Design a protein around this ligand. Structure first.
Ligand SMILES: CCCCC/C=C\C/C=C\C/C=C\C/C=C\CCCC(=O)SCCNC(=O)CCNC(=O)[C@H](O)C(C)(C)COP(=O)(O)OP(=O)(O)OC[C@H]1O[C@@H](n2cnc3c(N)ncnc32)[C@H](O)[C@@H]1OP(=O)(O)O
Ligand SMILES: CCCCC/C=C\C/C=C\C/C=C\C/C=C\CCCC(=O)SCCNC(=O)CCNC(=O)[C@H](O)C(C)(C)COP(=O)(O)OP(=O)(O)OC[C@H]1O[C@@H](n2cnc3c(N)ncnc32)[C@H](O)[C@@H]1OP(=O)(O)O
Ligand SMILES: CCCCCCCC/C=C\CCCCCCCC(=O)OC[C@H](COP(=O)(O)OCC[N+](C)(C)C)OC(=O)CCCCCCC/C=C/CCCCCCCC
Ligand SMILES: CCCCCCCC/C=C\CCCCCCCC(=O)OC[C@H](COP(=O)(O)OCC[N+](C)(C)C)OC(=O)CCCCCCC/C=C/CCCCCCCC
Lengths: 449, 449
């Protein structure tokens, strides 16, 4: 039992998480094979039982926390449903519950535990509360992309339990809305585009690609190391070696996430929740619940071309439920700073997340300024119009996006001020000084030309 | 020097604070004797010099913190003066500066230091920012008590420095607005009600009363003790003795504040800032800058009769700049809870202030419910109309307000969860259980009759 559990250099918790994630396929197959049920309560109870069983298997003494959390949530949502006080009360309650969880947890390296499922659950649930409050407004246009996306005040006595504890998107899965779940519940998501289809092209391809990334990461894992950053053995002697190591790093840690999300996607594609219609050619498209892009993620030089292709669901949720809801402050920068601060507090332990997200804001602002300036000058346009040879558009432009990505990703994997600063000072604070110089130089030359 | 500094059981810091507070009278006399100055910059420079000298005398390495704080404040107020972003930015900046100060300070017992002057300064300065933002609105009625109280957008290049560093109300003094300070600056506060008047009846009486309370407190100080609560020597054996001790306590700690505020009042009465007009009889009244009431403070049985007579200035400021500015949430209880939470965060170290203010909210709600129910019943009105003898209105009603006052004041002087809980459990959590029972009983009997 335990002899082979930790045999291949794996802890007791990572293997448990990976087997729990992989165990979603048989449940989806069982549900799809038995679809002749015409009563929704059976599906709801099945989802609740499967979610609770998975939570028990992962850790058997902490699921009652999330159970009482969702219980209190719909208990308080039943009363004062449309009141503006309700949304603020549920926001404060959920945020303080998560913050107390982090404060009393005090994890050190990763320590896979209840925190991730509770975090996903609470963000999805705050989204549900916002949607319910908005759905009680007047039926007019109101940014017409909302009526298809907002609940119509229907009773939610039991659907909230099954919606919260979905077996597919429980650990790190997507964060779909409420209306699509209700459409799935009583069997009208696909009349005949996807009853039998597909389970052949999309799901198998996604599973195979996830397995490919997983084997690549586990083959490249022992060769590289993370604690070598702290260690001083033949590291502080050369300079360019440190930059090259950080460049090679950062592009390898991210894969740790990638595989995971991809395999979760497969489960959804098997259920049918990913359907959103068909294109002009008439072929149905399933790229609606996707969390990553196949190709654009790793073949984009622009800084802003990654935040739109790394994780679609969380970024889209933040854009939808912060920017569109905080337009009464007359400054876009303040709204962006508030959104990034909220995203930092979402999973921020001590200091690494704050500095990482501040740095990210700095890159996005600098990139927007630079891209605005180019192709907007009487003289620089001709220089940029040189298209016979493009050395700048070549590898010269790249191998700098990855370097700053690793530079801003270092505080993410080391969130203690001592280790953070000790490993971050040896690179001479290159990114901050370089971007401060650039940010103070561009306005003057822009005014010059 | 130091032989007599600590001779009478006094630390090096309390004596410094008391001598600094008392040293305000000679400066006021010097200013009043030389009033023929027709230029405001001389008065402003005099106020700044006196305030900086007092700050240097109290502690000589930390005043630059407040100097840079006020500098940054009016630097950021110069730009985007009327923008809604400015008020939120200054609010966040001041609050986070004070919170960082408390977090990096980590005081234990009282440890008189920079924190109190910085706290008073930052609250006054946030008030100034709110006033400046409001003054840029339309000139209509707008709760007509505001035009006399709001600035009219006049330049504030130098008046902010003299206003912030007033020598009178610097440590624990009052928190007067901006317009009255400007009226005082160029000499039109009193044309001839108070050029020579008075400095005889008001100031001397206030000083004498403050000295009387001070000598009473210092005579009753060594007889009683505070650490006896922690000590178990012949304390945990009897029960009624603990309640009697807490009753006698609480009424003695408050005097520690009282004297202080009173003596500060004297300084203001000498300057002339306390004038607000005259009554119907024509005699001028100086009870405008007062921070305590002479008689109503200690001769009121009602719970709500103390929050309107303990400290007028801070309570009035909180009522003016929170309730009147947070009416867009449709629930009074939420506004009250937010105000009390802000007042707790104002000077809250770890836990005692939060529980103290929550308890205070509970008493005020319970008292309002009880006073609403009485004299509002078909049958209980006759019982309450018995006026031949009033044992209830006698000492029976009192000796219970003081007891709950001490019960809710215990966590204020012991703000560490260990000592707090250890001294608070021995009284069997009497207040919380009694008021929970009363709060759950009154609605049913109210519906009954
Ligand atoms: C290379 C760049 C980044 C490099 C990475 C650096 C650090 C990396 C940090 C973490 C990476 C490491 C591990 C990540 C993996 C797992 C950890 C979880 C963390 C994440 O996985 S997270 C990754 C980044 N995480 C973000 O979070 C960044 C993006 N997050 C945003 O939020 C963005 O900002 C975005 C792109 C969504 C918005 O970008 P945008 O600015 O282009 O949006 P846009 O302007 O196009 O929209 C126009 C609409 O603004 C509204 N509008 C106008 N004026 C307004 C005003 N005055 N006030 C308010 N609203 C206003 C109008 O209503 C209009 O609406 P309409 O369309 O109808 O006109
Ligand atoms: C015995 C009771 C307390 C016992 C003490 C227990 C614990 C003691 C705690 C500390 C004591 C120890 C040491 C203290 C010494 C130094 C430490 C510093 C701490 C202090 O030194 S601190 C002491 C207490 N510290 C407080 O802080 C309590 C009071 N602090 C408040 O804030 C109160 O609450 C108050 C009385 C000021 C307000 O009392 P209130 O409720 O009677 O006011 P009211 O109703 O009369 O005003 C009607 C107006 O509400 C507005 N309005 C209506 N509906 C609304 C809605 N839906 N939303 C928003 N606004 C609405 C309308 O606009 C209307 O305006 P209009 O007049 O035009 O009609
Ligand atoms: C614009 C912001 C300016 C930043 C403000 C700077 C605050 C730091 C200032 C003064 C602290 C002096 C402390 C007095 C003593 C307290 C000790 C303490 O407790 O402190 C510890 C350290 C000092 O070491 P030690 O004396 O104990 O050495 C002892 C030897 N040994 C190394 C073996 C441990 O103090 C430190 O250095 C603290 C190092 C950093 C800690 C906080 C992280 C800063 C966060 C930056 C991100 C802000 C972005 C916000 C906006 C986000 C938008 C998305
Ligand atoms: C409605 C609110 C419900 C309250 C939530 C309760 C949270 C407490 C819960 C669970 C904590 C279990 C902890 C697991 C271990 C972590 C240790 C820790 O770090 O914790 C320490 C203590 C436990 O002692 P130990 O194991 O270390 O003993 C060791 C032996 N020895 C005594 C020598 C030190 O944990 C404690 O007991 C904590 C005691 C209290 C600390 C926070 C104070 C509560 C605040 C209440 C006011 C809320 C009002 C808000 C609204 C304001 C409106 C104006």
């Amino acid at each position: 039992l335990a002899r082979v559990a930790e045999a291949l250099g794996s802890s007791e918790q990572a293997l448990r998480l990976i087997v729990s994630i992989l165990m979603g396929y048989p449940f989806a197959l069982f549900q799809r094979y038995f679809l002749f049920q015409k009563e929704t309560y059976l599906i709801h109870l099945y989802n609740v039982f499967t979610g609770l069983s998975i939570a028990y298997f992962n850790f058997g003494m902490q699921f009652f926390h999330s159970l009482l959390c969702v219980l209190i949530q719909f208990l308080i949502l039943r009363l004062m449903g449309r009141t503006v006080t309700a949304v603020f009360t549920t926001f404060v309650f959920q945020m303080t519950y998560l913050m107390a969880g982090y404060y009393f947890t005090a994890t050190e390296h990763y320590d896979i535990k209840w925190t991730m499922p509770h975090c996903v659950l609470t963000l999805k649930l705050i989204g549900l509360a916002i949607d319910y409050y908005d759905g009680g407004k007047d039926p007019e246009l109101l940014t017409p992309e909302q009526r298809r996306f907002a609940v119509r005040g229907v009773p939610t006595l039991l659907e909230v339990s099954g919606f919260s504890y979905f077996y597919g998107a429980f650990m790190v899965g997507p964060q779909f809305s409420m209306t699509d779940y209700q459409k799935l519940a009583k069997g009208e998501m696909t009349d005949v585009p996807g009853q039998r289809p597909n389970s052949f092209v999309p799901a198998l391809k996604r599973l195979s690609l996830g397995l490919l990334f997983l084997v690549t990461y586990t083959l490249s894992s022992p060769y590289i190391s993370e604690e070598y950053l702290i260690s001083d053995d033949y590291m502080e002697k050369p300079f360019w070696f440190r930059c090259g190591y950080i460049l090679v790093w950062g592009k390898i840690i991210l894969y740790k996430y990638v595989t995971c999300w991809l395999v979760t996607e497969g489960v959804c594609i098997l259920v049918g929740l990913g359907y959103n219609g068909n294109d002009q050619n008439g072929k149905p498209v399933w790229d609606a619940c996707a969390n990553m892009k196949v190709w654009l993620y790793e073949t984009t030089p622009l800084f802003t071309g990654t935040i739109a292709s790394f994780n679609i669901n969380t970024n889209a949720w933040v854009a939808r439920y912060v920017f569109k809801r905080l337009k009464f402050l007359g400054n876009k920068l303040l709204s962006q700073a508030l959104a990034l601060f909220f995203l930092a507090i979402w999973h921020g332990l001590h200091s690494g997340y704050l500095v990482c997200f501040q740095m990210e804001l700095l890159i996005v602002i600098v990139e927007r300024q630079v891209i605005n300036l180019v192709r907007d000058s009487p003289t620089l346009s001709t220089l940029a119009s040189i298209t016979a040879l493009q050395p700048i558009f070549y590898v010269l432009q790249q191998t700098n996006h990855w370097m700053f990505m690793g530079y801003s990703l270092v505080p993410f994997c080391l969130f203690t001020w001592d280790k953070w600063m000790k490993v971050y000072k040896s690179i001479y604070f290159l990114g901050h000084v370089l971007f401060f110089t650039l940010l103070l130089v561009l306005p003057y030359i822009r005014k010059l030309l």
